[PDB]
Amino acid sequence: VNLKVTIDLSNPMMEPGDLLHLDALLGALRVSRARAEHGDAINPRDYHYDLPLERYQAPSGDWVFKASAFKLKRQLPNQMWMQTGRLSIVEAARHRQSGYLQLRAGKPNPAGGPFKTSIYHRPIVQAELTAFCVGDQQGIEALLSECRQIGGKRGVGFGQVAGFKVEPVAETDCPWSWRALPADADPRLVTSEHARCIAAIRGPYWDRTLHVEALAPTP
Amino acid sequence: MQIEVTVRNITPIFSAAPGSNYITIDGTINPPPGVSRFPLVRTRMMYVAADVGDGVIKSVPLQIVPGNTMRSLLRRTMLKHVIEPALVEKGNKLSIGAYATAYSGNATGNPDGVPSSFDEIATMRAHPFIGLFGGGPRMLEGRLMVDSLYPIHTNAERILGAGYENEMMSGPITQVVWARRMDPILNLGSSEDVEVINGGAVAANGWIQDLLANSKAAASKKKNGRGLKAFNAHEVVIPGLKWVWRISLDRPTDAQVGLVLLALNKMTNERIAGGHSKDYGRFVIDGVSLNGEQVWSQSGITGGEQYFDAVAEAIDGLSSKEFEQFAQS
Amino acid sequence: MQIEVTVRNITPIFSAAPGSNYITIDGTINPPPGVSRFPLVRTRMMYVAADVGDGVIKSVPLQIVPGNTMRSLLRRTMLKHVIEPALVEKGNKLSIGAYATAYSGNATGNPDGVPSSFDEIATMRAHPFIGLFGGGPRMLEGRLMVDSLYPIHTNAERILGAGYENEMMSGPITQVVWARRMDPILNLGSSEDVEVINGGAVAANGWIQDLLANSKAAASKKKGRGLKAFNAHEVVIPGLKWVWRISLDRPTDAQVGLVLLALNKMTNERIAGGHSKDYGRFVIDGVSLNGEQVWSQSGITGGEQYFDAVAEAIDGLSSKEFEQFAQSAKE
Amino acid sequence: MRYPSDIVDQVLKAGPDKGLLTWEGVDAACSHCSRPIQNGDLYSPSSVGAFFSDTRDLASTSRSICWRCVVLRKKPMLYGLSAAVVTQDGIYSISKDVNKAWLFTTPPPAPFLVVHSSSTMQHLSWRTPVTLDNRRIHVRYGPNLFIVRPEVVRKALSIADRVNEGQKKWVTPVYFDRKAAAMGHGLITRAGAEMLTQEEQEFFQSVTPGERWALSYLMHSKRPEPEVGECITEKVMTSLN
DNA sequence: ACACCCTTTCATTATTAT
Ligand SMILES: [Zn+2]
Numbered sequence A: 001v002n003l004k005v006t007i008d009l010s011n012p013m014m015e016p017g018d019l020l021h022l023d024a025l026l027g028a029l030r031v032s033r034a035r036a037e038h039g040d041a042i043n044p045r046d047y048h049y050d051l052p053l054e055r056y057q058a059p060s061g062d063w064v065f066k067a068s069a070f071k072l073k074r075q076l077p078n079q080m081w082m083q084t085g086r087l088s089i090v091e092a093a094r095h096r097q098s099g100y101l102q103l104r105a106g107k108p109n110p111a112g113g114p115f116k117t118s119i120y121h122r123p124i125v126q127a128e129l130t131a132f133c134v135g136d137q138q139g140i141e142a143l144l145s146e147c148r149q150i151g152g153k154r155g156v157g158f159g160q161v162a163g164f165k166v167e168p169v170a171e172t173d174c175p176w177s178w179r180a181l182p183a184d185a186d187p188r189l190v191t192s193e194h195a196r197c198i199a200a201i202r203g204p205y206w207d208r209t210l211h212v213e214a215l216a217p218t219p
Numbered sequence B: 001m002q003i004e005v006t007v008r009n010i011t012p013i014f015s016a017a018p019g020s021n022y023i024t025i026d027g028t029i030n031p032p033p034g035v036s037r038f039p040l041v042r043t044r045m046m047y048v049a050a051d052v053g054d055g056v057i058k059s060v061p062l063q064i065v066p067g068n069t070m071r072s073l074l075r076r077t078m079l080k081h082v083i084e085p086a087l088v089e090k091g092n093k094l095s096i097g098a099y100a101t102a103y104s105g106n107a108t109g110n111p112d113g114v115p116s117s118f119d120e121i122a123t124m125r126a127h128p129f130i131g132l133f134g135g136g137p138r139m140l141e142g143r144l145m146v147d148s149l150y151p152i153h154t155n156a157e158r159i160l161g162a163g164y165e166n167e168m169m170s171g172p173i174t175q176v177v178w179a180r181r182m183d184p185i186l187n188l189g190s191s192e193d194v195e196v197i198n199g200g201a202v203a204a205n206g207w208i209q210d211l212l213a214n215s216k217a218a219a220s221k222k223k224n225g226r227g228l229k230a231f232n233a234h235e236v237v238i239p240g241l242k243w244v245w246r247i248s249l250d251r252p253t254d255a256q257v258g259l260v261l262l263a264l265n266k267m268t269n270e271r272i273a274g275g276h277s278k279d280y281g282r283f284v285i286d287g288v289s290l291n292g293e294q295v296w297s298q299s300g301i302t303g304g305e306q307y308f309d310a311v312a313e314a315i316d317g318l319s320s321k322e323f324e325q326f327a328q329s
Numbered sequence C: 001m002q003i004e005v006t007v008r009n010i011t012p013i014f015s016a017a018p019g020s021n022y023i024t025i026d027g028t029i030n031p032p033p034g035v036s037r038f039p040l041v042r043t044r045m046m047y048v049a050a051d052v053g054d055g056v057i058k059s060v061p062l063q064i065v066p067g068n069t070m071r072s073l074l075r076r077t078m079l080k081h082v083i084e085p086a087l088v089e090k091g092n093k094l095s096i097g098a099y100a101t102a103y104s105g106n107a108t109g110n111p112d113g114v115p116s117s118f119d120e121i122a123t124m125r126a127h128p129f130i131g132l133f134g135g136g137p138r139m140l141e142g143r144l145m146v147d148s149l150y151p152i153h154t155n156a157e158r159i160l161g162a163g164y165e166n167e168m169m170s171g172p173i174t175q176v177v178w179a180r181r182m183d184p185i186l187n188l189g190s191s192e193d194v195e196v197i198n199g200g201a202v203a204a205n206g207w208i209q210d211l212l213a214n215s216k217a218a219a220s221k222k223k224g225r226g227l228k229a230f231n232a233h234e235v236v237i238p239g240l241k242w243v244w245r246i247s248l249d250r251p252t253d254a255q256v257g258l259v260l261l262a263l264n265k266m267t268n269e270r271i272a273g274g275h276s277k278d279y280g281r282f283v284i285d286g287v288s289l290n291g292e293q294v295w296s297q298s299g300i301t302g303g304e305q306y307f308d309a310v311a312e313a314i315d316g317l318s319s320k321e322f323e324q325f326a327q328s329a330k331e
Numbered sequence D: 001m002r003y004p005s006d007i008v009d010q011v012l013k014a015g016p017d018k019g020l021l022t023w024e025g026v027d028a029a030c031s032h033c034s035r036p037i038q039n040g041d042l043y044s045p046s047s048v049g050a051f052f053s054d055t056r057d058l059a060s061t062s063r064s065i066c067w068r069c070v071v072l073r074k075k076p077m078l079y080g081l082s083a084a085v086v087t088q089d090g091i092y093s094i095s096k097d098v099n100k101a102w103l104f105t106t107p108p109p110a111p112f113l114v115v116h117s118s119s120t121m122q123h124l125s126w127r128t129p130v131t132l133d134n135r136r137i138h139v140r141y142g143p144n145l146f147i148v149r150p151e152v153v154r155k156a157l158s159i160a161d162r163v164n165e166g167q168k169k170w171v172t173p174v175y176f177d178r179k180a181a182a183m184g185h186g187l188i189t190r191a192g193a194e195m196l197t198q199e200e201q202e203f204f205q206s207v208t209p210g211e212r213w214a215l216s217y218l219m220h221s222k223r224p225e226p227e228v229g230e231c232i233t234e235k236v237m238t239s240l241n
Numbered sequence E: 001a002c003a004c005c006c007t008t009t010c011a012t013t014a015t016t017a018t
Helices: A022-038 A089-098 A137-145 B067-090 B096-102 B118-125 B154-160 B201-222 B254-269 B305-316 B321-327 C067-088 C096-104 C118-125 C154-160 C201-222 C253-264 C304-315 C320-326 D067-072 D075-079 D097-104 D150-162 D190-195 D198-206 D209-217 D233-240
Strands: A003-009 A071-074 A079-085 A118-125 A127-132 A161-168 A195-199 A212-216 B002-009 B021-023 B038-041 B045-050 B058-063 B144-151 B174-181 B230-237 B242-249 B283-290 C003-009 C021-023 C038-041 C045-050 C058-063 C144-146 C174-179 C231-236 C241-248 C282-289 D042-045 D064-066 D083-086 D091-093 D114-116 D137-141 D144-148
Touching (some): A003 A137, A071 D198, A079 B045, A089 B067, A089 C118, B002 B254, B045 B154, B058 B144, B058 B154, B067 B254, B067 B305, B096 B321, C058 C154, C067 C096, C067 C253, C067 C304, C096 C320, C118 C320, C241 C253, C253 C282, D042 D067, D064 D067, D097 D209, D137 D209, D144 D209, D150 D209, D190 D198
Parallel strands (some): D114 D137
Antiparallel strands (some): A003 A161, A071 A127, B002 B242, B002 B283, B021 B038, B045 B058, C003 C241, C003 C282, C021 C038, C045 C058, C144 C241, C174 C231, D042 D064, D083 D091
């Protein structure tokens, strides 16, 4: 059907360090749908490839989904979210005195350990997310209608999806190739933005054990 | 499952921000160099998109409490008010890993990756507290999203959506509050004032002479011991305004919703985002819409009885060994 | 522990707001430049979202005393009246850094980033005074939270909630008060008046010629600073009913007893500032201890267990905890 | 050169410590290297102490550290690579800003590996992928992974040099934070807002946050000419041995 | 005897906008 999906989001999201693929989001949504039906005790890797998406086969194995990484049209200047992880030293001292916490150590350490006060700064963008793919319009729309947030750090409320629209587009108009592609991919599909890296082309894109020599663009 | 918590800050809100911010004696924030500037620590603000007065959207400064802060506040009020009293009632104790997992989501019990079977992932995700946040060595994804505390304000209108145009504040929601640290040795005035001090007058005069020596040293330096005289500023969010707070449970059990409901019941003692010595962050809960159904009364929550009963059967069935096997193995 | 006390200031409140504020001779606040403006030190104003009209909630001024000022007032009250009398009536004594830690929170600037021990933190938050005001070089979290002093006003209606709809003020709440600062030797009129001055008429006349030269220099500058300084300061009007929200996160019995003893010794203390003008004098007409009214005119007359606990704990008060609180791990 | 742990055998040559076990059964990837520990490969049970805070960047939950990552987790190899690029010939330092100018403009053509510390010492090297192509660099900085394009870096440098021709005082278009920690990291300055075209403002917004972090070390006033860092692989080999 | 805990210990730059 060769369609393009765009997403607008009320909350800003984490700016993705690597490529936010549409097939990754659809795989996580299908995994959540399978958890809704088949209970929480499922293998997520059984259903994360059960997508309304065509599959491109490289000449030597190495199939990828026909989706693309989300391109960002920035509505806002890029800002930075400071966040901290601090275990409450006062509450831990009270629990250690009362014996609810069984800690023999008398001194905390903010440099490292359980009481490491840690600071970390993640980039923030509010934008329009455009992804080009090859898939059935009806299947994607239901998955993205079950989608509430996009991007990372969704436990702290970031990147709440205000809405989305899924619309057909011409065959030469959409590049779905802006995507983590294998090294033996078709040179028609490979543009100047695609470069060699150690990256996942599929599935769990964070799984460093699944990273391959890939031709991927830059977010 | 969606929970909307509408709160009203009784005291100012101050979620401190990083960066070197400065302010003059007048309220000019970040003055250009070549003038007397003072250290300022502002509230947590992010730029958000808003369309007020025009169809297009512009980046406006919205002063919020982060979702990480409210997430840890929900976690800590469930621990302080439901989880730890129940565990003390059964007489159960927590280890270092179970405490750093339950109270901070930290993986310091097993820093090395801990493998969890999909079945035990399901059972711990069905736990009333563990499935809400996850964390620990397993890094379980929680059932719970805790959004940022958004002020009901025209800047937040894209985040708020419809249904909040009434009681919507406008303009600046912040104020620079000035705080100084007096040197109490300078306020010593009599022998009876100073005779609680070892040495008394001689030690007091030694402090005075050390302070004047440091002042002359700083004056000659301008043309590293810091004294107790300080004068600084902190931007707060003004009291009395209204905030929304989104808590979405991703396919929960009834006991997890009951635990969040017990948190909202006992949360009136807690404080939002710190500023602890100045009593900052004290609030009252004005409304709780449970999937859009208003459930908050003045005395806690009336109704929602299946969640309260499920969390009751959870907390009489709650022991620490679930937390130990969630942390260690 | 949610202490809500209500006071009545019988004398104006001057918590001086830092700024560069001016005023005309008529009383217009911060006039446009070019007109003759006098210096004005405004009282501490907060902004507050309030209900003006019907649901037209707006950030309006409400002039208050800061919670840092009221916190230090409570600290110095329980120090000068409870902690230090019980610490002098026995042989205990503090170092100058320990006095500095007990009053200003810290013994110096430049704190140590090394934290404190868990047993240390538990014992210090179990202390009657240190757990209320946890400062030190290693920064404790003191369990006392002190609110700002809010006037019971319609502009604080969202803050106060319910139970204050009577005895609530409205409209203007402040007043500009002017001060002259007249030169003393202009009042000199006779040789009997000048006999205390070295030289008598000679030094007085010399200061007069210096004043004339300074006035000529100031006129040349318009078209070294004298003793004539006419100025203004905005105060809060007296007779107001104010509220003050002490709170304590899971206190020891002795700590809230110490707060009750400081509130019972709040008589003849000044709230913020203007010492010479007696500003800040107040009468407490209410104390509520988790909502129950525990203030008579004679004193508290309630909450007895807190008072016995703080009596037994200032009986056991010593300087060792203060000294090991003030002791820097770096120093 | 396929995994980051290949900077232990191919470069900064070292062997196993020989107190390590031999892997048995089905193969599992290392928790740190992301390298598959095959049968007959030396491995350790994961004896990470409680001060190890990099569980989020662990590749697998196998609790099995490969010997190459045991060498990678050595403290001399930790602090010795607090600012380093590891090419196929040797390790070079990127502590100086001229060294980061050489790293991010005209980089070496090897499959190198860029590690940098946002703190005193962090478990830094094993969690970051190797940069096989020159034009896409995987930088590790503190707790975050970063992606830097050298050609876009030179384009931003050409714009920044062009907008300050003929001016006595060098004014930056956009503030970038070296710690990548300020809220204004990525916020364009008012001189840059009044000077740069909207296409160039969207260009400076369109770069990756790693490129913003890199440009922070190379948008300062005393503009760094790209100069190679001194080779430190002898230094960290001596510190390791 | 091994997990838990308390101290050294070592690495290198560098300017700053709002
Ligand atoms: Zn490994």
